[PDB]
């Protein structure tokens, strides 16, 4: 049936729980996040790359005038120059020694190789998380993908799972991102049409084959100072090149919570952040009544050496007596200690050794076998290894992060102070009311 549990959003770290129905044998279930994806909503503003300045073949009118026209070409510049007398290899090109105007043009296009080297400017909106889960209850394992919002019934063959809402809202993307050749950057780019020379986004189009390009590259057309035909001009640097020199570090190296950043579509994968509430409806063919599961009569817990480590640095043995054989489950009923196994075979008499992970200096958790509880008591030493290649399997709680010896010392001192104050107050009241009694 229903089981409401909260699962930490950490990929690869199993979460074990025991569903205890009031009439059936306890059932093990393990919920693990295998993969997570945090994809936002994106909208393309424009594309940008290095521009190509095109200087056409100049126009020359020999004994007349010319005028500048209007064009739709990106950053279209035009200028008329009179008193011109241009030359080529063959010689002079006009028959008037003066009054021989020349027309200069300049505009920009996309370079031939921009089909590979280009950036896409995108705006991002609310990011939605999807996770892949592996759920094993009893003898059956189930794999499914669910949306962590709290409403969508996560895909579930012979099951039903609802995840969400996530306990925190996190996104590695600012409102504006750029993507270049698979690398993602948080960059505040100019709006479409708001181009500035020498900065990123100085040439803008919807597509690379788009026929309408807007640009602002600060083209200046100068009067020709030589006798051969020439269109002198000066211009600003490419803002795309300047940005490629000043891009900084990508988002694949700066994203928090260990997110892996991927494109097509833009997403963050395998982030570790927050907690995920999950509601699962277990099918009733996965429950067996207590009349079929073994019923052990006693169980004791002995703890071997333990350390509070990120790995299974502890061990314990359960000594039991069952009336028959079977396949009972096991479970630790503390938030700071987790077992490695989930089920075991039990016989008439025997022992089972179990391995656990704790964060507490003291191991005072409760362990169940066939649903029967025993108390484990020991103290765990600090680990020797400083660094490992695993994540910690449990969280660190202030109560189970102070040793029992330290708690005893602190309680002894605080209680001694409280008892001194109480003795003082009782002496004050008693030896004052003695005045009332005596007269």
């Amino acid at each position: 049936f229903e089981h409401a549990t909260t699962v930490p959003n950490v990929p690869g770290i199993p979460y074990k729980a025991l569903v205890e129905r009031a009439g059936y044998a306890p059932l093990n279930l393990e919920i693990t996040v295998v993969s997570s994806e945090l994809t936002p909503s994106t909208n393309k503003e424009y594309v940008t790359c290095k521009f190509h300045t095109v200087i056409p073949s100049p126009q020359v009118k020999c004994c007349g005038s010319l005028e500048c026209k209007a064009s739709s070409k990106a950053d279209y510049t035009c200028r008329v120059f009179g008193g011109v007398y241009p030359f080529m290899w063959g010689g002079a090109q006009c028959f008037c020694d003066s009054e021989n105007t020349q027309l200069s043009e300049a505009y920009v296009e996309f370079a031939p190789d921009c089909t590979i080297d280009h950036a896409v400017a995108l705006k991002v909106h609310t990011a939605a998380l999807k996770v892949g889960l592996r759920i094993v209850y009893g003898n059956t394992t189930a794999h499914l993908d669910t949306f962590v919002n709290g409403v969508t019934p996560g895909s579930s063959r012979d099951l039903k799972v609802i995840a969400g809402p996530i306990s925190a809202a996190f996104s590695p993307f600012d409102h504006k991102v750029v993507i270049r050749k698979g690398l993602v950057y948080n960059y505040d780019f100019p709006e479409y049409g708001a181009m500035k020379p020498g900065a990123f986004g100085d040439i803008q189009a919807s597509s690379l084959d788009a026929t309408d390009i807007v640009a602002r590259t600060d083209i200046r057309l100068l009067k020709p100072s030589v006798k051969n035909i020439h269109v002198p001009y000066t211009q600003a640097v490419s803002g795309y090149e300047m940005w490629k020199n000043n891009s900084g570090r990508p988002l694949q190296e700066t994203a928090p919570f260990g997110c892996k950043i991927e494109v097509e579509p833009l997403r963050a994968s395998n982030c570790a952040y927050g907690h995920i509430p999950i509601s699962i409806d277990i099918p009733d063919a996965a429950f067996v009544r207590s009349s079929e599961s073994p019923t052990i009569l006693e169980v004791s817990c002995t703890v071997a050496d333990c350390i509070y480590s990120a790995d299974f640095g502890g061990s314990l043995t359960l000594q039991y007596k069952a009336d028959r054989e079977g396949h009972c489950p096991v479970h630790s009923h503390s938030t700071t200690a987790v077992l490695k196994e989930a089920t075991t075979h039990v016989t008439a008499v025997g022992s089972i050794t179990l391995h656990f992970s704790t964060s507490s200096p003291q191991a005072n958790f409760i362990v169940s076998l066939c649903g029967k509880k025993s108390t484990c008591n020991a103290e765990c030493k600090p680990p020797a290894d400083h660094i490992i290649g695993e994540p910690h399997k449990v969280d660190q709680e202030f109560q189970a992060a102070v040793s029992k010896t330290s708690w005893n010392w602190l309680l002894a001192l605080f209680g001694g102070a409280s008892s001194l104050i109480v003795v003082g107050l009782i002496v004050l009241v008693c030896s004052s009311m003695l005045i009332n009694t005596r007269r």
Binding site: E253, T254, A255, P256, F257, H386, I387
Partner: protein, 52 residues
């Protein structure tokens, strides 16, 4: 688009002090070392390293 062979560096030796590591790096030519933290703050770093 194609594929090109790129060099693999000498694997470093790690020393593991308390709440920290040190990396012993060997590099004839500049190679890039980046780090980041896996919590709320990344504290990201990046440096091209030549020499040992």
């Amino acid at each position: 688009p194609t594929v090109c062979p790129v060099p693999l560096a000498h694997t470093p030796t790690v020393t593991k002090w308390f709440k920290g590591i040190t990396l012993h790096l060997t590099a004839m030519r500049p190679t890039l070392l980046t780090t980041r933290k896996l919590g709320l703050r990344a504290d990201a770093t990046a440096e091209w390293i030549t020499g040992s």
